[model samples]
Target chain A: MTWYYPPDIASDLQSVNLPAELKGEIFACAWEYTRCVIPNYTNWNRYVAFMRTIIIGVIAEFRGEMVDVTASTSILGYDLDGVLAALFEGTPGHKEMAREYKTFLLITADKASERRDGELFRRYVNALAQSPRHWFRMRDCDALARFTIASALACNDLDDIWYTEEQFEILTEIGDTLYDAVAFYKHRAEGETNSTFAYMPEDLRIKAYSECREILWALDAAWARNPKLVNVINFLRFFGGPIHMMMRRYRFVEENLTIGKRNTQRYKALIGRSEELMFPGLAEFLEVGGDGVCDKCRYRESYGAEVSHQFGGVELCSECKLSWRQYLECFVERAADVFPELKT
Target chain B: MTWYYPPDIASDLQSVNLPAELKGEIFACAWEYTRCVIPNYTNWNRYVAFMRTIIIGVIAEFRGEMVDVTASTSILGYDLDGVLAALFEGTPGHKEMAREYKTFLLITADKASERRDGELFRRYVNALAQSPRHWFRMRDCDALARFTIASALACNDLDDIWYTEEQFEILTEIGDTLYDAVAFYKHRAEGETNSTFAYMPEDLRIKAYSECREILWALDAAWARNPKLVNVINFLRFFGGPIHMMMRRYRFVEENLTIGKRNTQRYKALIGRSEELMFPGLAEFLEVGGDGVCDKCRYRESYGAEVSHQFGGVELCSECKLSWRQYLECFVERAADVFPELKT
Candidate 1:
């Protein structure tokens, strides 16, 4: 395979200080998500057990306080920061943190798929939660980073099994560009976020490209047997996608046609121009598609809160729910069914 | 004084390369929405001028087929290959490549403000569209390294007015972190974004204290007199505030949450455990203030289809237009009114 691996791999794989047990736990959790979208994958229950052992080791790392990695993961939960604070106590050790991370992932999962049956799912999440990290010293970022990294690693592994190097590279590049845009927003505020920019210096661009390639390939290879699996993998990618996207919102601003002064007229003008530059055909698209059907959903959901309250949360469920998973898998299966190129 | 300046400085100081004429020709632009709830500052005429110039510049860059520093600023557009494509060709010299890198600055006085209008705005944006370098490209890690560097030098001169070294350092650091995170995604995909993870990279650990110092200072400084301006900038800045949010859409899987094959019951248990972790108030905050509301009006106004369909047919009158020159004066005056220190 002429596939070029991102250089960050060899260095990162080793630097990943996660204990083997914790790492396994992280992967186990991610595998669960994978199975939700692509059911019929080999024994998932065993994967969770393996993941639990890994989480136990992870919680063990914290002797005093937990690290909150919300900024790192782009996945935020209510009191998530609080959860990290508890992890810091360290009395519960590594297993405690694993349980918490697992529990949160499950909670999020239940909300997403009623079919997943909130009650049945919670039983396991509760088991993990009851195990102990629930009472750790307390930290959010540290604990979250551990889990987020685990998730990313699992997904990367999956992609390695499923995608072609070329396809993976392209997808990751798109994400990289988007990330650059998001991080630039750090400048909009204070402090030294530009330092973050150095982590992916142009010298390392190839490495970044390699990582994406690995992910795409893994995803590609894993689903070779079932065309439906390929769609399932692609569909689920979005849930994890926000992990990267949350960071990009910052860059999205600088990328737009913006002049910094807080003038309403300027605001209008800048937006008008950005609409032209960013979307180009957005206007035509909206006209053809109908003005924000999401707004109507917001209206129906609120019914009569206030015209002011109508946010039309248009893009939310469109890409982020269990149904989204089913549809995307179906779409991919449909695409592959129709296009030979998609058929591996 | 190491006092903060507003982000608008970045916007006003750098006007896009557009025609010298067209300041007075304008029309009636309405506020169409509320400010207290969705404070929008980028709507007025001066902002429009800046955007149009950039738009034209982007278009020219697109047409030229290729782009470089000289062609980007002077010529107007470039093709996908990063080469200068077609020049505006609207007039004789307009078609000629730019002789020097364009200077972008704000209208510090009434004279500059005197010329704020749509036509000039368009021309300036046209110039920006053509230009090749800025803060963003400077940090860009793309293969066009030499050209980006050269462009940085030719175009990099601005008064040290708004951002302090401390501020820039932090901003750049965040930029670096975002870049790293993006790289993380790419590398993780191909298995490479981990090199920086060897030791906890100091840059990526940007906390709110470091990154948000300038913006916070700016907010405090501008609040009293220019409450209106403060309201607007606050709206923009408020966007970067940390919050827990979930993307409504998922691309790869049906659910954003993942579960392992064996741990299906455990995953369910984890959900029950999550409910226990929920922050009492955090949930309320997310439910109420979950959405990024500051730019909503601008998002709706210019981004909405009705305006785009009209395209060039829409123009605002001079009587209704607002300029950065006017905004700055108000901002300074109001800020001074609020804080006696700025008056000095």
Candidate 2:
């Protein structure tokens, strides 16, 4: 119903304060570079709708006029993306940020139409859940929902490589919890494979936010006295979830593809040439041309990208998909886990 | 093959010292009374086998020789049950413990034969699992595997009523966790209700004990600095698991009954009159004449029984069995959850 998300970002502006939006912005950018390597980079492209909805959501909420973009009603005609670009129209570092996001919102409805064939998603979970190793990830599903926060902490180490241990161990445990929860639920959803089509039924949203609120109070106490873990717990709990179907909306892209309301292969393919902007070879093609900043590259400055890229992959074989699918399943699954309650 | 059990009572004599034998003695007694209200009291009677196996397991282990009675090996020689009774030939208190257990083991091979028609058990789980309320219990399955420790703590309040809150909250959480885990596993073991025969595989042994080991080390640190939780966790972790057949063995009672190895109605009926000792009206029939202590009465003394009885139930109706079955299912399921791993 409401779009302002990670959802906790709103609360940061209110009370239960700590530094979360700061984290989200970084986390959002970290996602940028990771997509540079995604098969065709649609995965990178997918977040635009996700982020746009949030920005639109936050600004609208800023004025107390936020409409659930998912339900209907775009704040239309401001050229928010252009304004975003021109605003940072100066230095390489500054333009990189705006250009990063303008490029983010660049994949609008038409592009959203193409990105969400969602084929990779459903099959991803079904296969992801079949194995026990993956099942271990979602075990502490509560923690996994805060992955963005976790990722954010990992991004900067909260300013220390040592703090990263606390972060990494936590990331490890939560990752396991996420897989377990997913495996547990996939069967609960019950069907043959991804396309078998039954509404996946469970979402982490309500629980995640509830976790966030509790986390907030707990963290507040910590901050008053001393804390880091508590801060993140509350932040993660903001509970994802969303507004959808505008195509640009991540949750929307999810809904369209999962239930077959819209598919990238069919609709957006008919709408434009930017579809060419996507392809397995898109990573190389882009790097060969210019030095435009990657929308998801904010996570990786040097080592971050290399470590991720080295282990990430270079080929898109079945094995590659098998691994990719699991990771993708986990991320998107969390996205939906917090969906359906986009409170307008 | 190992007959002596609780598996850890074996170690209490060795390492990770604690008075578990003291608790198991009481916990065993507690279960005795609870069964009196079971639809036919066979649920009560069923424990005879459960007890015998543990006794057999413990004693066998005491002699430094334990055979997996589940696999086959009886420490056959002296009448252990009679020896048990004669050993406590004294006042009601003395006799009750012995007589209680003697009576406990009374549902021997012959009686064991008559009890496991298993209808009540199978249907119970299928019905038990259909509800989310039930699913919630098994969630922390590791804890549920240690239901006896938790039960024992509740039995004596570990000494006082104050300690009960700690026990109760634990019981509550574990109970919920148990239900959740069971619901999950039931779906995993999928079938059409009770009569369907598919091995309902998954035993909590490996995990429970692993938990117990982790619990033990943690607890040692606690006992060193003062602790109760660590003690129980390790104790629960010794794992309830296995050793079956001869019918008197609880795990055996489970296996034979679950997969239809033995139907109480058929073979046991061909074998005896002791079968009449069973039946829904058995409790009233026994108490009508003598003041002999009930086998499970040690926990009830007077108030425990009454409180348990008041809420437990008075009638043997569908609702009665419905409720009874859930409790019963949780109990036996854990017994079996730790079953397959009885290391010989």
Candidate 3:
């Protein structure tokens, strides 16, 4: 949305003495690339966090420090310099990321050299691995970036840290495998559903709703801490996962045993919470019940049976409410759209 | 589903000077614990791999060596001995793991003493971390075990590895935080859904189906390799996530935009695959299309919408097929039910 250089960025770059313009150029490039990359990101704070990590990786490279791509770096090893290098190199192909421009700027800097500092890089990666706050950063990006960067970095001949062409191929293979594993779950949350709820068995419905609520709470925490980096799609999938399980359980029970009644209060609470998550503050205005049909005007509901309730409840159809819910969706979508950084 | 001791256990214990019966006792304890803890797990290969890691952890501890916990440990530091010791001490209350029982057996053995063997322990953890075969091991347990084993190894006062109680607490805090992060996705795949297909947009439907099929391939790989450790719930959720996303996208588009025709082939493919995953080889006999009502018999199709089609291609209702589809379901369900380790 609104571009602002994070305080941490400035502090992180303080050790790397360079012209103000160069510093500005680097930040600007990183900012642009980040903005162009994660278009569907909804949280500015998390967006900033993700950018901060990228900036950290680039600057750390310039400063001969290893990039701390994620908190999982303990198992990730000390060769983070390679990881960041590979990531920076590989991402250039992604035109929307504008990673090439950033890489060109960083690589062509006067200080760009084969002067590799393993200990310095290792320390930085280790520190990041140990950092508390770093644990909460976006996992998918960090994971993919780590592998991509590592693969590229291994190609460097500086400080005799170069891998053979064959070795590099093997490295790329490893990186690609890891990337697929981590990247596989991207865009999981934004398209979530609650269709299973209608047929979910009682016990499983309770477990699913409870677990789904916990997932939302965790997502809320992630958003609260770093809004930009939070994977809404992943969290959306998180919500759906438990519901899926519950539905299957329901089916299993239905086929074998007499179906049971669910906990109404728990179900209602989950429905309320789910509404709040989908369209914040809209749940309070929306009425519940009566097959999502209009009470006064017989405007037949056509879209989401659940979502229709958010447009001022089942008392009136969307048209009767002057398309208030539709307007709300458009407002939210447009608001997210205005922030170039929030692209999905 | 079937109970049998893995050869790796016998080989592992062969090197130890302990009596065969005693070794059997130790293995039996670990086996019992492992079997008891993962009651819902269906894949035995994964179960063995999981147990293998635990055995490695316990054996390594007794031998004053490092325990291999992850596939990524090759890049991991040689300080794994310290890591595992620290990790083991941290997870005190995970009773299902029966960590204390396993720990007590190893720690109180005749070999237990203030022996210092960092290199040996480090090498073991490093090997575990590095092995490609080890990558798909139970992540949560392996992660927890790494720290736990690390913590215990550091207890050798003679080797000057002991940490103060406060230091251990901080280490526990770190381990716990990391655990939360890693374990966050533990149950994800098990609770997956397929409810989103009805409302998914055309493009997203294709994307979702493609992604879903990829996920299935991955799951199939896991089952083919290590069936016991794979959490069906988590994998189920994995399948459901994309499905959920598709459904929600379907709903959103259906409500906001003019509806469009989906790729019928792709739709059938996804539906067929989903059915196969839920009920292996069950879709071949199913029929398609109907108001879920029988034309001649007026039989009410119950149990499932997708399942109802299996009876007679939407022509003959579920009843007209002489409850053939229902019988097939019960037969499959019962067969799966017979496997104690295959509990869902």
Candidate 4:
């Protein structure tokens, strides 16, 4: 589908000095977002105006010159805070992003699924935290190389919206695309990582594809249940399904989206505490999943703190005081259960 | 090809209650570690005892029961501090690993190279920091899943010690195995990451292999030049080459070993500050290579900090304030230049 690029924003973006691809991402996010609500009569100009405003803020904030944050900040009905949060939170020295922007965007565009996206986010976070390389910095911006890789993926993911087919097929295709994008990253991350997707075996790619079907299926399922959520469903299918997952996958940015209360809260605590952090967080450092709900258990165990134990090399709440072997008689490791892929 | 597992420690490990793979891993580390210095006519009993003691301290520390940290701490003249630091630092309640254990291991056994191994450590850190997914926790400890993966690769690497062949051939094969190990990890990391090494292409694997040859070449060159360093050199070739790289690759561990002054200094600041960390550190962040001499340029720019700028989404030292494009006309992006595998 031909995207309506705002000439003003487009023109301004060209002068932003980012990698052309990244500038393109700033525009792509705008285009993907505005597609959620076409506005009255599908008036292309109004749609373009929102795109201009959406792209402008990010472009301007990128450097002091291209434009002013105020000019585009108020124009779109998008959540200014989430927008600010998404771009600037990890930018180092950037100010607090407006929380109101994320809420507004969720309500406005339905670009994501309330229930499943959070689940996906948690799973993605769990997985990345467990993956071979976990290039967590992919979440940090102006590391434009990783960003460029993510934006290149936006090309395919954004198209998945119209890459129409039987709903499951589309989701499956989205999954396939997700698999390819990671493969692409390893390809780009080549000499640095010493291994590529090629070395990755078929069963795992099949596993990635199957998971894609599962997560994207949540979007299809959500749309079917509430027709009122159709636009948002479509938006998710188009950009949400792949983009959110990709952000977590190749980009390693988990807090960038507002998926659900639990996932968001967990990320809130994580990013709030971990930005510019120099060490491994407790849960990560401890190998404990912290009650199987959040990695940031903060040592607040339901069981008495003094009774905590390390069993099977996994830390357990005071209640389950046995080695992995002893625990297996009655229970699976909590982390093993929460993160099934890591073991099984 | 047959590994001599010390019966007492092996027996002790069986009851320590870690995943079977992990129990096996503690043993593997000991075996791989001891292969470097074959003491006294290669006394089988003495070898078995060292292996017993080597594996015992780590096992004992897992819980309060298996054995005492002191019982095995001094049996081998290995730098006790490195051992303590390696096993305990990230284990929540574990204490300082004896750095003495590590230094002793290096000096007595030649498990690593003094000069080039440090070089490899920095490259591995740089690469992991930049890889598609950084799984940095793999280094922390007893996350055992990641460590299990590292140890699984250990099976291949420990064998490389005697997988004798022509010099370059051994290194190339070692690189190939390193590629396979990453592929193995992604395979395990599937479902969570949404992709596998299968999606990675051949070029990247070639790149990984090339880097393996390049880094390992240093080990071979060192050995060729000074017959005196043969044991240390062989240790590096056997486990050091692949094991060290894998620790970085599959494990996301940067500080587990000490290789050189510069890399050690860099990791010193990183791990020293990052243990139980709850956030992204400045260097994984900021996207600034901060000068490749160390990721911990610590904002201490040679030029001056007061006048820093973000050009082309890349942070620049005050002296070179130009966007990637303008900078390109005159020079390649600094990050791009340092991490050539990233873009070029």
DockQ of each: 0.01, 0.01, 0.02, 0.01
Model 1 quality (TM-score): 0.20
What tier of docking accuracy does candidate 1 attain?
Answer: incorrect
Q: Top model by lDDT, which number?
A: 4
lDDT of 2 by residue, B1-344 (tens): 11112222223223212356543543332222221111011121222333333444344323322221212223333344353333222322222233223222322221123232242222222222332233223222212222334222332223331223233333333323322222332323332121101111124422322232222222222232122342243222112111010112232112211211124353233223223222222223233311222232111111112122122111133443354345434542333233322111
By lDDT, the better pick of 2 and 3 is 3
**What lDDT score belongs to each candidate, Candidate 1 first?**
0.26, 0.27, 0.29, 0.31
What TM-score results for chain B in every one of the models?
A: 0.26, 0.27, 0.24, 0.32
In model 3, what lDDT does residue A206 have? Answer: 35
Report lDDT (Cα) of residue A216, candidate 4: 35
Clashes of 4: 50
TM-scores, each model vs. reference: 0.20, 0.25, 0.23, 0.22
lDDT of 4 at B37: 22
Comparing 2 with 4 on DockQ, the higher-scoring candidate is 2
Model 4, A33-147: lDDT tens per residue?
4432211112233334445545644543343333322233442334444433333333322231122222222212211233223332333223222322221221111112222
- Give per-residue lDDT, candidate 1, residue A212: 33
Report the lDDT of model 1 for residue A341.
47
Residue B111 of model 1, lDDT score? 10
Query: Candidate 3 at residue B268, lDDT?
Result: 44
User: After superposition, which runs of candidate 2 have C-alpha atoms over 4 Å from their true positions?
Assistant: A1-316, A319-344, B1-157, B162-344
